[PDB]
Every structure is written in C-alpha cells, then in structure tokens.
C-alpha cells in the first residue's frame, strides 16, 4: 500500500575506545542475534553482567541495578518469504549498553 | 549497486525514566535535518562529567560517557525522486553510563 526502493550500499562513519562496556559500573556483554531473513541480519544485543553495579572496591553493590538502555529500531523483513529482496518493515527493541540506577 | 524494496506499513513491534535515575543521567537535545529521514532525531547529551553519588552529590572520579549505536538513516537519491533511497550510516548517543577512568 505504499512502497519503495533503497540501496544498501553504504558510505561514512573511524572507531576506537568503546570499552565502556568493561569499565562501566553497570558493565555488559554482547549477544549475537543472526537471522538470515532480516535485514541488517546479524545484531547485537548488550545483556547487563550484574543485577546491581560494581563499586570502588570492585565488589557487587545490590542497592543500585545495572539495567539496559534500549532504542527502538526499524529492521527489514523478507515479505514474503523466500523474496530475497522485498521487504516490510519491523520496529524492534535493542539494548545498547547498561546504566546503573536507584531503585525507588 | 544492490536494491531492494520496501513496504512502509509497519506491523508489528515490539515511559521507564531511567534518564533521570541514573548515576550517569542525561538530556535529550534534538537534530532536524529536512534532507533526511527520519528527519527528527533525538540525542543523547550526559549531565555531568562525573557521575552521582549515593548521597546525590556529583563525583568527579568516575564518569559519565555516552553509549552510542551504528544508526541507519535515509537520503533521496538521486535527490528529488521521492521513492528511491540510499542509505547513510549515523552515530547515535542514547544514554549514558557511569565509567572508571584510567
Ligand atoms: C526509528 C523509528 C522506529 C522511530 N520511529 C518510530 O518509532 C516510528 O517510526 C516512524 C517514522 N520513521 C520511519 O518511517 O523510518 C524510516 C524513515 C527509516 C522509514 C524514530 O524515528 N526514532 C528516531 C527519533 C528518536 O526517536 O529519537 C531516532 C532513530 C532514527 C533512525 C533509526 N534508524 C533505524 O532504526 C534503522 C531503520 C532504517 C533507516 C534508514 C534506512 C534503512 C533502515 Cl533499515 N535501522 C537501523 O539503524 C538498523 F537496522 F541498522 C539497526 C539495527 C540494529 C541496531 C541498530 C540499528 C532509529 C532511530
């Protein structure tokens, strides 16, 4: 019902640093998410190590709550099925990195 | 040159004020560009340098940073044909976390 027609090839931006992830109060790892019928098809997803954040001392602090921070994004999907380059679009959750937070 | 097509019907998906909770809290600040779509942009920007205590006062050993993300936005191309896009690779700030420095 209303359709269009977009290039995949890409250009700009070079990188660097982005180990907050490990030096974060409320560090993360990242989970591969690869589905072949989606475009982009591989994603990755930041999953909180701890359920509270880490402290000066380096030790566990559960009165405070590492928690993701999450965009929502549009992702392609193959419409309809075994079409390899027509697509719909899907809105999606992804959590991007954690931050540390106050319960109340 | 690889092309494709796209349905903009979008189905399916799928308030939490973690802005304002965090040790490392931010604010949003807005990037219009009409030449663009989306055209409207949300950025996140950190408060502080440094990240806030238990006791609500600010401590500069620690810092706030962003965490960024790889965004796809869109472009006419060749300009003025209203169907036909290419695709341009953005950063995108969506909120921050408290960080130990070196
Ligand atoms: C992103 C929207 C979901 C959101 N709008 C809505 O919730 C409803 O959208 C109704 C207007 N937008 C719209 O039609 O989008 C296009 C005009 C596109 C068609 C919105 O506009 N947010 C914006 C305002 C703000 O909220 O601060 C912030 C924003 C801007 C762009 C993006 N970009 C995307 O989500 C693109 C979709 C896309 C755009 C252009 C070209 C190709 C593709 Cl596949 N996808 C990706 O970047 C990604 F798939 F690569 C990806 C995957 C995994 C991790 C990170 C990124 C995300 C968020």
């Not at 700009?12 to 030096?23: A, E, G, I, T, V």
């Not at 992702?75 to 991007?96: W, Y």
């Amino acid at each position: 019902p209303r359709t269009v027609m977009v290039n995949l090839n890409i250009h700009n931006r070079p990188k660097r640093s982005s180990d907050y992830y490990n030096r974060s109060t409320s560090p993360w790892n990242l989970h591969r998410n690869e589905d072949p019928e989606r475009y982009p098809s591989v994603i990755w997803e930041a999953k909180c190590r701890h359920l509270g954040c880490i402290n000066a001392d380096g030790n566990v602090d559960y009165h405070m709550n590492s928690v993701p921070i999450q965009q929502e994004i549009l992702v392609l999907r193959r419409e309809p099925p075994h079409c390899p380059n027509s697509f719909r679009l899907e809105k999606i959750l992804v959590s991007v990195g954690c931050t540390c937070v106050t319960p109340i």
